[PDB]
PDB file of C-alpha atoms and ligand atoms in Angstrom:
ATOM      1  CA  UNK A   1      10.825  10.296   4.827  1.00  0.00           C
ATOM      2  CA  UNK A   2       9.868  13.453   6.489  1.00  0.00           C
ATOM      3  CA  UNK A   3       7.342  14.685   3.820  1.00  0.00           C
ATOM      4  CA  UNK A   4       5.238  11.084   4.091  1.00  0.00           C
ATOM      5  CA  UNK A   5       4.821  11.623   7.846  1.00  0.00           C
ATOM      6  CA  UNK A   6       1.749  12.397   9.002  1.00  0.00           C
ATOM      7  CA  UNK A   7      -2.266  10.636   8.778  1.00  0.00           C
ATOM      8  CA  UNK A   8      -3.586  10.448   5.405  1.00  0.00           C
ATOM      9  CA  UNK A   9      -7.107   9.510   3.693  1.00  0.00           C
ATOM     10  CA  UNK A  10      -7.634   7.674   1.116  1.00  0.00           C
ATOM     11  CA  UNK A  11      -9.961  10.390  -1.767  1.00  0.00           C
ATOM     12  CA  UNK A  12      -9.962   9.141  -4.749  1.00  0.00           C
ATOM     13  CA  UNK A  13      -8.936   5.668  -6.474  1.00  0.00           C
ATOM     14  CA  UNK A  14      -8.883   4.428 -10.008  1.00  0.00           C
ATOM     15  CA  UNK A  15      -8.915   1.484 -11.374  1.00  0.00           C
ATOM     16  CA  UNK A  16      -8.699  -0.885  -7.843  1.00  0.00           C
ATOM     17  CA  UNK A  17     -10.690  -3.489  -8.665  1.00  0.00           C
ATOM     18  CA  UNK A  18      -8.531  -4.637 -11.872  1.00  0.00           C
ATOM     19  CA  UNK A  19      -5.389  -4.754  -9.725  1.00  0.00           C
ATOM     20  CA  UNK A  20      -7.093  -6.951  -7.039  1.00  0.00           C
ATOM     21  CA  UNK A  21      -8.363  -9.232  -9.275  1.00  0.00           C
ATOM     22  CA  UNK A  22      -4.909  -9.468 -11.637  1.00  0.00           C
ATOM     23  CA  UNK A  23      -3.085  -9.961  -7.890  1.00  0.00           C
ATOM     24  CA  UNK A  24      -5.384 -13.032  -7.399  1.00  0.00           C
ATOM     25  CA  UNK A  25      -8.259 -11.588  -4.462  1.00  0.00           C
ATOM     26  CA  UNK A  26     -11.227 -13.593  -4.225  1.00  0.00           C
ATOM     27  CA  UNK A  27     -14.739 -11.867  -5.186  1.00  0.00           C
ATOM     28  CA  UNK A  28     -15.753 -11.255  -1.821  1.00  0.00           C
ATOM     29  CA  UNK A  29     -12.589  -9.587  -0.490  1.00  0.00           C
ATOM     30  CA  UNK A  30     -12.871  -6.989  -3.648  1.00  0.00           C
ATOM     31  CA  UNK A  31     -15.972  -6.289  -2.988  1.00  0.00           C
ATOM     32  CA  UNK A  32     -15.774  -5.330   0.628  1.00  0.00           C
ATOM     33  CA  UNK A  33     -11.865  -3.751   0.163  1.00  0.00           C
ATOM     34  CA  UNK A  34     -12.822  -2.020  -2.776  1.00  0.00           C
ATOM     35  CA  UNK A  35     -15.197   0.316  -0.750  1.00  0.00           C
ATOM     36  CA  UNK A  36     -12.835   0.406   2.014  1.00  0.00           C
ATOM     37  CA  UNK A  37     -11.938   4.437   2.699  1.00  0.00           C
ATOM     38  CA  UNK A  38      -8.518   3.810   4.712  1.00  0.00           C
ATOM     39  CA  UNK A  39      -6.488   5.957   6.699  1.00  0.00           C
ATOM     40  CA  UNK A  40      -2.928   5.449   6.511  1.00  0.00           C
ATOM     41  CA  UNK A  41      -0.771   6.364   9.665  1.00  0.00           C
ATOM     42  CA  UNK A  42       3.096   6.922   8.567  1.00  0.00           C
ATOM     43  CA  UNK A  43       5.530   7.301  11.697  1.00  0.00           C
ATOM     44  CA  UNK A  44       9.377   7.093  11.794  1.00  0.00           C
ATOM     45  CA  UNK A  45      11.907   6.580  14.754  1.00  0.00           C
ATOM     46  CA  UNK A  46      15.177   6.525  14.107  1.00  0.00           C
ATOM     47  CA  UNK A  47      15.949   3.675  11.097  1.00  0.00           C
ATOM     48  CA  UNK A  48      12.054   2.403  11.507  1.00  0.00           C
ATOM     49  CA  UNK A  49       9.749   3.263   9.476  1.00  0.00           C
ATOM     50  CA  UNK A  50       5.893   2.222  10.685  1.00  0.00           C
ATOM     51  CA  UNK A  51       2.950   2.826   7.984  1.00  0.00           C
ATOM     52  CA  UNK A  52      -0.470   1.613   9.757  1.00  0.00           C
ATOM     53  CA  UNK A  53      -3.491   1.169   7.161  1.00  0.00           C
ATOM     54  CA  UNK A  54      -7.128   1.418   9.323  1.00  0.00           C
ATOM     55  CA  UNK A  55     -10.688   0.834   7.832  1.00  0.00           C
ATOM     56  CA  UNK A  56     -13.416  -0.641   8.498  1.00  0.00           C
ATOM     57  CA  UNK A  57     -12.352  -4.095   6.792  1.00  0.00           C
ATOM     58  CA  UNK A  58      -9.000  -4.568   8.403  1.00  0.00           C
ATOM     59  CA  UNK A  59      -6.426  -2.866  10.092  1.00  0.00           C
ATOM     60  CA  UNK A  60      -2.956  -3.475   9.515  1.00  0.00           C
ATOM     61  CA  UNK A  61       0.623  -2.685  10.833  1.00  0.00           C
ATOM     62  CA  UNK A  62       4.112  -2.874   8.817  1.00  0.00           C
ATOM     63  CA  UNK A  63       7.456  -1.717  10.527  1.00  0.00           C
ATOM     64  CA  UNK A  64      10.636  -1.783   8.397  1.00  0.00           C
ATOM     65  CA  UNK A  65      14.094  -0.781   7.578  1.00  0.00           C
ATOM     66  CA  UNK A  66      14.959   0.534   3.806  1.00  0.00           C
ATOM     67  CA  UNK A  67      16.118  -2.379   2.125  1.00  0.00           C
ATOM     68  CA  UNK A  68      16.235  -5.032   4.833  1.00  0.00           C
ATOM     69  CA  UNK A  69      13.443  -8.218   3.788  1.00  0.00           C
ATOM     70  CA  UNK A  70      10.455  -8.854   6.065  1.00  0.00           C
ATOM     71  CA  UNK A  71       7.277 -10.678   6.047  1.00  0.00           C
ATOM     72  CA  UNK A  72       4.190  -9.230   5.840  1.00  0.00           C
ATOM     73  CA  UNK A  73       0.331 -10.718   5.983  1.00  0.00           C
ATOM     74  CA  UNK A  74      -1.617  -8.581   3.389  1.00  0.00           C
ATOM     75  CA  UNK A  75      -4.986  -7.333   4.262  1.00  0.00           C
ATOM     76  CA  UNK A  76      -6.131 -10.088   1.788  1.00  0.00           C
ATOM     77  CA  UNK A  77      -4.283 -13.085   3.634  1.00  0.00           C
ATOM     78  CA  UNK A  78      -1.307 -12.854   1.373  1.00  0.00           C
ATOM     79  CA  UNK A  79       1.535 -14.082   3.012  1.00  0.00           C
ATOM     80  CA  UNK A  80       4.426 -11.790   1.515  1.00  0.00           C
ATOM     81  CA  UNK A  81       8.150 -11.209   0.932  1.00  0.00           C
ATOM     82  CA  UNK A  82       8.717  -7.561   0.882  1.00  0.00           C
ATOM     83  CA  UNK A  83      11.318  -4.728   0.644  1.00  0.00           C
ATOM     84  CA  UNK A  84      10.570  -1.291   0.946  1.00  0.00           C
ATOM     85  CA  UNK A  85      13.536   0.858  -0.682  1.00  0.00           C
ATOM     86  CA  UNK A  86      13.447   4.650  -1.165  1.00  0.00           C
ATOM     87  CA  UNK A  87      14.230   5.294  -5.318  1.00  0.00           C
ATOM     88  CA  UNK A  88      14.714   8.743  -5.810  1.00  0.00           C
ATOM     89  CA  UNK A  89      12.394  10.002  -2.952  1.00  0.00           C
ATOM     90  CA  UNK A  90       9.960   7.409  -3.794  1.00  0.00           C
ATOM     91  CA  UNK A  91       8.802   4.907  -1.036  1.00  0.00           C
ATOM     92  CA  UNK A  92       9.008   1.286  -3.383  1.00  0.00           C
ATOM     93  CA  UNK A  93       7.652  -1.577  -1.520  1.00  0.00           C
ATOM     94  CA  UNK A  94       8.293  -5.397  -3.610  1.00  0.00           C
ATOM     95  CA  UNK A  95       5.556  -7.669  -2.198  1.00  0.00           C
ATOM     96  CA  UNK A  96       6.733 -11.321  -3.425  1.00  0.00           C
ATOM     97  CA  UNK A  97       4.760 -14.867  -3.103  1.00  0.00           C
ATOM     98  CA  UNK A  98       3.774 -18.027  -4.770  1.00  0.00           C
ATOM     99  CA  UNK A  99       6.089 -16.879  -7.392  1.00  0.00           C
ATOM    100  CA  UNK A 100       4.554 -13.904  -8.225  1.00  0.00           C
ATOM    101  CA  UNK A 101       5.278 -10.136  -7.360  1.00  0.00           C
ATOM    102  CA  UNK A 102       3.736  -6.920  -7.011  1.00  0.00           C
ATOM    103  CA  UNK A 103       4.938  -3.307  -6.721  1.00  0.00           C
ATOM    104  CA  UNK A 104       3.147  -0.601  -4.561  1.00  0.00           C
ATOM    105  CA  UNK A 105       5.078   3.078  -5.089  1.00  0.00           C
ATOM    106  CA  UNK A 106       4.181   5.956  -2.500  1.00  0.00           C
ATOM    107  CA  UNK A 107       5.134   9.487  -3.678  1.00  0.00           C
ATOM    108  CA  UNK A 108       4.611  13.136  -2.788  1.00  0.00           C
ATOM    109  CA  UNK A 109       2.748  15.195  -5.248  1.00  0.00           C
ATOM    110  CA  UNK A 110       1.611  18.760  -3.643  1.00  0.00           C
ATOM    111  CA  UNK A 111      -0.469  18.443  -1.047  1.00  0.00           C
ATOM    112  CA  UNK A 112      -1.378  14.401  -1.881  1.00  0.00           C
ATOM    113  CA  UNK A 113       0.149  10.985  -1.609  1.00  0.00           C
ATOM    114  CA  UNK A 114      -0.039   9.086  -4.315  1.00  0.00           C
ATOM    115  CA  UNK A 115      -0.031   5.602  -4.187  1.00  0.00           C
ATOM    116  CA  UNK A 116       0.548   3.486  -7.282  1.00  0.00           C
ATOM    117  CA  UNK A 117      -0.276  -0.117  -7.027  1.00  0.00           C
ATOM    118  CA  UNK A 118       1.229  -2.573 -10.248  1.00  0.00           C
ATOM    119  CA  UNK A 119       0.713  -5.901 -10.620  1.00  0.00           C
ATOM    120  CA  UNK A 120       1.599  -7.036 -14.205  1.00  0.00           C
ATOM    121  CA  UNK A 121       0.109  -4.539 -17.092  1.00  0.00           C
ATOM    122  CA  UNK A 122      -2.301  -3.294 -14.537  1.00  0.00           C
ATOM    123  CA  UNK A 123      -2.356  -0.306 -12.175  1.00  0.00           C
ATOM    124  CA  UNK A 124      -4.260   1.258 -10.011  1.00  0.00           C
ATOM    125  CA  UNK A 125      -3.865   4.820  -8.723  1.00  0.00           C
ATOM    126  CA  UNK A 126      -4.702   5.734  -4.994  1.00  0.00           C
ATOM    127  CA  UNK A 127      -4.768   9.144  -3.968  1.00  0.00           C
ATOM    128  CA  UNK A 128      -4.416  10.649  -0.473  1.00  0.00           C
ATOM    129  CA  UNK A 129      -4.758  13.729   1.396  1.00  0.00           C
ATOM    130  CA  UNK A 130      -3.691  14.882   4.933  1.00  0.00           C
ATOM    131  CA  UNK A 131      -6.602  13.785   7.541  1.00  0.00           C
TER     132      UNK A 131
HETATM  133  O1  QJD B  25      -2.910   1.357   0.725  1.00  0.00           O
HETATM  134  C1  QJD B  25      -3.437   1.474  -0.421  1.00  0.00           C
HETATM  135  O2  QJD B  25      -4.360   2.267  -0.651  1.00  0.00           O
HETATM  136  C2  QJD B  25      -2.933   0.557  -1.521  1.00  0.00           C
HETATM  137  C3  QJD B  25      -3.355  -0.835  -1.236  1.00  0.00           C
HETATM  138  C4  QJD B  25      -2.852  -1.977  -1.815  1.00  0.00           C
HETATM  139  C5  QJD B  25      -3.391  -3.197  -1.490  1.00  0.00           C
HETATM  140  C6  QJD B  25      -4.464  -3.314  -0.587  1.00  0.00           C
HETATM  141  N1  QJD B  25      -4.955  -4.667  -0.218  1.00  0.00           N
HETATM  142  C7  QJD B  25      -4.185  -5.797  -0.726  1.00  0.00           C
HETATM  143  C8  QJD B  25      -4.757  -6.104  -2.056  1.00  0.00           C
HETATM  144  C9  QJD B  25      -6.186  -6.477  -1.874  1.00  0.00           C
HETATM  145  C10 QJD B  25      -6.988  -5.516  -1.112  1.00  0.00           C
HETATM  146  C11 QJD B  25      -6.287  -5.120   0.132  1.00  0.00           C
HETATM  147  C12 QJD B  25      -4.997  -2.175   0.032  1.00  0.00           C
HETATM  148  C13 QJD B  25      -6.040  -2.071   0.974  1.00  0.00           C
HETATM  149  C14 QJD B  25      -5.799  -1.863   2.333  1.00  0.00           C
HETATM  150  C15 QJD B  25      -6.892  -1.720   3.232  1.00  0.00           C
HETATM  151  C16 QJD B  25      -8.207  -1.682   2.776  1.00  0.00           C
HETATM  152  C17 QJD B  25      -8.463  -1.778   1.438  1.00  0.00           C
HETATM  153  C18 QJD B  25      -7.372  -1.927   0.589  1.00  0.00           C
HETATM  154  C19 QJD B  25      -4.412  -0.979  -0.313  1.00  0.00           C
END
């Protein structure tokens, strides 16, 4: 994951508040998330990969090995299954509960990464540049 290294901020996102709602977050939380500007922190050592997401509404921590399960609590109090897999250099993180799933995809794309959130028919697109 060499090229997703680094501290990245969030520039530009598109269509945000759709996906929130169509993953189930409450008015409130979209509100305040939606004008969140995060910084994402993306570390590796050795098989353990760390991205760290900090803003002013929450800051949160996931450490993981490619393909191996974990739990994860959301920034909106999800409490998640998820596997992060890399799919032809693309970071693909599976976020499963209540029956229900979600797919987040990080990818390089010149000088940005682009995160691409799906949840059903709808997507949002979250781009960011090195801090
Ligand atoms: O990291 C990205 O930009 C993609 C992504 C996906 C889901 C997010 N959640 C979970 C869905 C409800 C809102 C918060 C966030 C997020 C994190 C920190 C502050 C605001 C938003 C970011």
């Amino acid at each position: 994951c060499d090229a997703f290294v680094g501290t990245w901020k969030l520039v530009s996102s598109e269509n945000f508040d759709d996906y929130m709602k169509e993953v189930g977050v409450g008015f409130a939380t979209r509100k305040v998330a939606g004008m969140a500007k995060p910084n994402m922190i993306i570390s590796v050592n050795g098989d353990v990969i760390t991205i760290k997401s900090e803003s002013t509404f929450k800051n949160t921590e996931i450490s993981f090995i490619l393909g191996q399960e974990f739990d994860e609590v959301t920034a909106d109090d999800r409490k998640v299954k998820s596997t992060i897999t890399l799919d032809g250099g693309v970071l693909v993180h599976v976020q499963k509960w209540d029956g229900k799933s979600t797919t987040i995809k990080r990818k390089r794309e010149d000088d940005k990464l682009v995160v691409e959130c799906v949840m059903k028919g709808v997507t949002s697109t979250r781009v960011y540049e090195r801090a």
